[PDB]
Structures are given as C-alpha cells and as structure tokens.
Design a protein around this motif. Structure first.
Motif, PDB file in Angstrom:
ATOM      1  N   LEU A   1      26.645  16.995  -9.624  1.00 13.24           N
ATOM      2  CA  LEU A   1      26.263  17.888 -10.711  1.00 13.24           C
ATOM      3  C   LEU A   1      27.440  18.757 -11.142  1.00 13.24           C
ATOM      4  O   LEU A   1      27.932  19.582 -10.370  1.00 13.24           O
ATOM      5  CB  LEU A   1      25.091  18.774 -10.282  1.00 13.24           C
ATOM      6  N   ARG A   2      27.887  18.568 -12.380  1.00 14.80           N
ATOM      7  CA  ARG A   2      29.007  19.335 -12.913  1.00 14.80           C
ATOM      8  C   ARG A   2      28.512  20.562 -13.673  1.00 14.80           C
ATOM      9  O   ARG A   2      28.021  20.453 -14.798  1.00 14.80           O
ATOM     10  CB  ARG A   2      29.858  18.459 -13.835  1.00 14.80           C
ATOM     11  N   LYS A   3      28.644  21.729 -13.054  1.00 14.26           N
ATOM     12  CA  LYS A   3      28.212  22.977 -13.671  1.00 14.26           C
ATOM     13  C   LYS A   3      29.155  23.381 -14.799  1.00 14.26           C
ATOM     14  O   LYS A   3      30.257  22.845 -14.922  1.00 14.26           O
ATOM     15  CB  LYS A   3      28.146  24.092 -12.623  1.00 14.26           C
ATOM     16  N   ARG A   4      28.716  24.330 -15.620  1.00 22.03           N
ATOM     17  CA  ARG A   4      29.522  24.805 -16.738  1.00 22.03           C
ATOM     18  C   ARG A   4      30.656  25.702 -16.249  1.00 22.03           C
ATOM     19  O   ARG A   4      31.830  25.364 -16.388  1.00 22.03           O
ATOM     20  CB  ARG A   4      28.648  25.569 -17.735  1.00 22.03           C
ATOM     21  N   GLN A   5      30.294  26.846 -15.677  1.00 25.05           N
ATOM     22  CA  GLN A   5      31.280  27.791 -15.168  1.00 25.05           C
ATOM     23  C   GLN A   5      31.132  27.975 -13.661  1.00 25.05           C
ATOM     24  O   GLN A   5      30.171  27.497 -13.059  1.00 25.05           O
ATOM     25  CB  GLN A   5      31.138  29.140 -15.875  1.00 25.05           C
ATOM     26  N   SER A   6      32.091  28.671 -13.058  1.00 28.57           N
ATOM     27  CA  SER A   6      32.070  28.914 -11.620  1.00 28.57           C
ATOM     28  C   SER A   6      31.402  30.250 -11.305  1.00 28.57           C
ATOM     29  O   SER A   6      32.077  31.254 -11.079  1.00 28.57           O
ATOM     30  CB  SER A   6      33.492  28.897 -11.058  1.00 28.57           C
ATOM     31  N   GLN A   7      30.072  30.251 -11.294  1.00 30.29           N
ATOM     32  CA  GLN A   7      29.314  31.463 -11.009  1.00 30.29           C
ATOM     33  C   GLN A   7      28.285  31.215  -9.910  1.00 30.29           C
ATOM     34  O   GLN A   7      27.983  30.069  -9.578  1.00 30.29           O
ATOM     35  CB  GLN A   7      28.615  31.963 -12.274  1.00 30.29           C
ATOM     36  N   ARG A   8      27.753  32.295  -9.349  1.00 28.46           N
ATOM     37  CA  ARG A   8      26.760  32.194  -8.286  1.00 28.46           C
ATOM     38  C   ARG A   8      25.424  31.701  -8.836  1.00 28.46           C
ATOM     39  O   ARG A   8      24.945  32.188  -9.859  1.00 28.46           O
ATOM     40  CB  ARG A   8      26.573  33.551  -7.603  1.00 28.46           C
ATOM     41  N   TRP A   9      24.831  30.732  -8.149  1.00 26.07           N
ATOM     42  CA  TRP A   9      23.550  30.172  -8.569  1.00 26.07           C
ATOM     43  C   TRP A   9      22.395  30.851  -7.843  1.00 26.07           C
ATOM     44  O   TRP A   9      21.294  30.964  -8.379  1.00 26.07           O
ATOM     45  CB  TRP A   9      23.519  28.665  -8.306  1.00 26.07           C
ATOM     46  N   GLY A  10      22.654  31.304  -6.620  1.00 20.60           N
ATOM     47  CA  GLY A  10      21.624  31.967  -5.841  1.00 20.60           C
ATOM     48  C   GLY A  10      20.394  31.103  -5.651  1.00 20.60           C
ATOM     49  O   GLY A  10      19.273  31.609  -5.605  1.00 20.60           O
ATOM     50  N   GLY A  11      20.602  29.794  -5.542  1.00 21.24           N
ATOM     51  CA  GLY A  11      19.490  28.879  -5.360  1.00 21.24           C
ATOM     52  C   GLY A  11      19.518  27.729  -6.348  1.00 21.24           C
ATOM     53  O   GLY A  11      19.481  27.941  -7.560  1.00 21.24           O
ATOM     54  N   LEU A  12      19.587  26.508  -5.829  1.00 19.74           N
ATOM     55  CA  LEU A  12      19.622  25.319  -6.673  1.00 19.74           C
ATOM     56  C   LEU A  12      18.440  25.299  -7.637  1.00 19.74           C
ATOM     57  O   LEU A  12      18.619  25.225  -8.851  1.00 19.74           O
ATOM     58  CB  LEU A  12      19.613  24.055  -5.810  1.00 19.74           C
ATOM     59  N   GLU A  13      17.232  25.370  -7.085  1.00 20.75           N
ATOM     60  CA  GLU A  13      16.021  25.361  -7.895  1.00 20.75           C
ATOM     61  C   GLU A  13      15.598  26.783  -8.255  1.00 20.75           C
ATOM     62  O   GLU A  13      15.684  27.694  -7.434  1.00 20.75           O
ATOM     63  CB  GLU A  13      14.887  24.653  -7.152  1.00 20.75           C
TER      64      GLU A  13
END
Length: 134
Positions: free
Chosen positions: A107-119
């Motif tokens: 999975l290629r995210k947009r920016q490098s930020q904290r997700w704090g949980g996949l779902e």
C-alpha cells in the motif's frame, strides 16, 4: 417497473469479511506491506481492489483452517475484505500478490504521516466478556 435482466450486480451473493487474521508493518517512507494469514487460495478467482481512501481484497480460500473460522461458508464462497483507510492513499501504485501461505499487499500512502491504526476506528463496544481468556 422491471423484473429480470437487471444491470449492475451487487456483491450481495458474495460474503464480506469483517475480520481477517493479518499483519501490516511500516515499510519505506510511505510504503505499507500487509501479511494475510491464509492458504489454499485461488489466484484465479482472487483479486484486490485498490481504492483512493480504501482497499478491498477478494479471494476464495479453501483451507479448512481458514474456513473453519467462518462457519456456514465454504471453499467456493467468495470473501471480500474491505478496509477503511483513515488517510488517503495511492492505489495507482498499489500491488497485490499472494505468497506461500500468506498474502502480500503493498500500500503506497500519499504522505509520510501517522495513521494511528490501519483500519478506521468506531464507536466503542465492551459489554459482557466473551472469548477473552485471562
């Protein structure tokens, strides 16, 4: 109105998974690999849809180990795993490929930020305890 010879066909007939045993680790800068625990999968009838703010994984498994978990279903039962990504992503670069006894989804995210949980989270639910073993 009209009966029969309809147009689009909803996945109704298909089964939507709510929880799938898997593990995703933070790779690269904005890369995210996923490891789905499942075997005896059909790469012919198993695909993965990469959305902008989500990602669905449709695959038909025939491993009693994975099936046993989901009663009422079978090897010919389609399993759709939809995940809601709190943050946007780049599906145009995402990739899906099965492995020995597990599945790999880049999975290629947009920016490098904290997700704090996949779902994405949701209303809390506790109630009387169940399987939770001490």
């Amino acid at each position: 109105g009209s009966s029969g010879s309809s147009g689009v066909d909803e996945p109704e007939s298909m089964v939507n998974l709510a929880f799938v045993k898997n593990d995703s680790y933070e790779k690269g800068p904005d890369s995210v690999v996923v490891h789905v625990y499942v075997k005896e999968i059909c790469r012919d009838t198993s695909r993965v849809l990469f959305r902008e703010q989500d990602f669905t994984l449709i695959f038909q498994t025939r491993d009693g180990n994975f099936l046993r978990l989901h009663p009422g279903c079978g090897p010919h039962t389609t399993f759709r795993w939809q995940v809601k990504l709190r943050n946007l992503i780049e599906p145009e670069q995402c990739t899906f490929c099965f492995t020995a006894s597990r599945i790999d989804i880049c999975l290629r995210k947009r920016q490098s930020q904290r997700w704090g949980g996949l779902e994405a989270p949701a209303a809390r639910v506790g109630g009387a305890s169940g399987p939770s073993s001490g």
